[PDB]
Design a protein around this ligand. Structure first.
Ligand SMILES: Nc1ncnc2c1ncn2[C@@H]1O[C@H](COP(=O)(O)OP(=O)(O)O)[C@@H](O)[C@H]1O
Length: 420
């Protein structure tokens, strides 16, 4: 039976986590929400299950409800330990949802403690004295202070998490972690005795992540980004529970759908345009006026024999202007809906390869495509695997978290997903 059950707050994050688990020796299946029985095939044969939710920015009560339903489903499949997966940049607001979901999951597991560790050195995220760094910049000087939905203006994760948590948030500091697994486990026992119910965990290296994983072998719930999962397969191997343990190219029409406003995604769009590749920009203000923007994007894609880029990707100043006119949630949802409609339309027209930039964007698109589950293929860039659906004629998807990938990612992804 499956050993590890994971709940991810966005669809790109689900693939990121599953990639890390597969690469470290756990057969993993990603489900899009909860599958009907037995709509997903060789699922009781997985070592790990990753449930993808679109719950990062919905109301906290709904995020909790969806997360509790996923937890029960995972328990019923036989899972022994659980991971709550959120963004390595801690994407949230004072209203949630990292705090409300983690605390709800702890209560439902009857556990009095977990860690919260979004560190991801491979993608430049480290944590020191509870403060999150992106490269050598604090979170709030990294570009995340300009995220369209969850601007992060405070790098102190203890303070940030405490604001969205009812119970005591503490710190598992780098100097304990540096001393190895036994010392870390001892410090966790001390934090619990101190009344800490959730601790931000420092991690300045992949070595620290493996130390944390081993120290937390005995916790029902672990929370963080994909990095905190690095060492979990080794725990099960050591315990004698898991033995020591691809995907085909899919040819056909492709498309790139970009709803992230990140610097990385801006750079990826600019590169596409630099190379003279066909692209159409989505104006949120046209969507709000009810102009036929999705139809135009479909027509644009249909007239091209090569993949096109449909993008709303814009500068922070441009996003701010749109939001002042329409509202943050309304603008964000119009764009998501548009890209999702374009994806559904393209699916009907035979498109088989989809590269999607943005977490929420991927949630919208993949739900509109009707995907029930994904098989995890090879890593394209840190945090971003190629994936395929389980249909007789599969779809190939690359769901790129907004901050991930190099400048050339769109082309790299299209090529790894398959041929023309
Ligand atoms: N030009 C724009 N104006 C307003 N909102 C936008 C614009 N472009 C993108 N957005 C919205 O910003 C949000 C980006 O979130 P997401 O897709 O999760 O990206 P990321 O992975 O970078 O966090 C989406 O709701 C998207 O629709």
């Amino acid at each position: 039976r499956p050993l590890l059950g994971c709940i991810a707050d966005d669809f790109t994050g689900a693939t990121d986590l599953a990639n890390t688990l597969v690469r470290n020796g756990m057969r993993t299946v990603q489900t899009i929400g909860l599958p009907d029985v037995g709509a997903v095939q060789d699922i009781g044969e997985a070592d790990a299950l990753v449930v993808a939710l679109k719950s990062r920015t919905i109301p906290a009560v709904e995020a909790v409800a969806q997360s509790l339903a996923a937890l029960q489903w995972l328990r019923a499949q036989g899972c022994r330990q659980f991971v709550f997966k959120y963004c390595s940049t801690f994407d949230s607001t004072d209203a949630g949802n990292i705090g409300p979901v983690a605390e709800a999951l702890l209560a439902a597991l009857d556990s009095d403690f977990t860690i919260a560790c979004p560190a991801f050195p491979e993608n430049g995220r480290t944590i020191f004295r509870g403060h999150l760094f992106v490269g050598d910049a604090l979170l709030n000087e990294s570009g995340m202070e300009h995220h369209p939905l969850t601007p992060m203006t405070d790098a102190s994760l203890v303070r940030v998490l405490q604001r969205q948590s009812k119970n005591k948030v503490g710190l598992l500091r780098y100097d304990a972690v540096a001393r190895g697994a036994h010392a870390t486990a001892e410090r966790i026992a001390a934090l619990r005795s101190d009344g800490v119910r959730m601790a931000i965990a420092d991690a300045v290296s992949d070595a620290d992540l493996f130390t944390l994983g081993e120290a937390c072998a005995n916790l029902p719930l672990i929370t963080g980004g994909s990095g905190i999962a690095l060492g979990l397969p080794e725990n099960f191997r050591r315990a004698g529970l898991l033995p020591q343990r691809s995907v085909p190219a899919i040819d056909g029409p492709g498309v790139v759908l970009a709803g992230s406003a990140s610097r990385a995604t801006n750079g990826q769009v600019a590169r596409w345009l630099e190379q003279g590749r066909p692209a159409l920009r989505i104006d949120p203000l046209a969507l709000a006026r009810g102009e036929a923007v999705a139809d135009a994007a479909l027509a644009f894609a249909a007239g091209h024999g090569e993949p096109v880029l449909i993008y709303a990707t814009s500068s922070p100043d441009e996003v701010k202007a749109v939001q002042a006119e329409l509202g943050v949630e309304r603008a964000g949802h119009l764009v998501e809906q548009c890209l999702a409609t374009v994806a559904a339309g393209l699916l009907a027209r035979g498109t088989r390869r989809f590269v999607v930039a943005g977490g929420e964007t991927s949630g919208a698109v993949v739900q509109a495509l009707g995907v029930r589950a994904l098989r995890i293929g090879a890593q394209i860039a840190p945090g971003v695997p190629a994936t395929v659906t389980l249909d007789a004629k599969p779809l190939a998807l690359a769901l790129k978290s907004g901050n991930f990938g190099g400048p050339d990612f769109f082309d790299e992804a299209l090529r790894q997903l398959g041929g023309h």
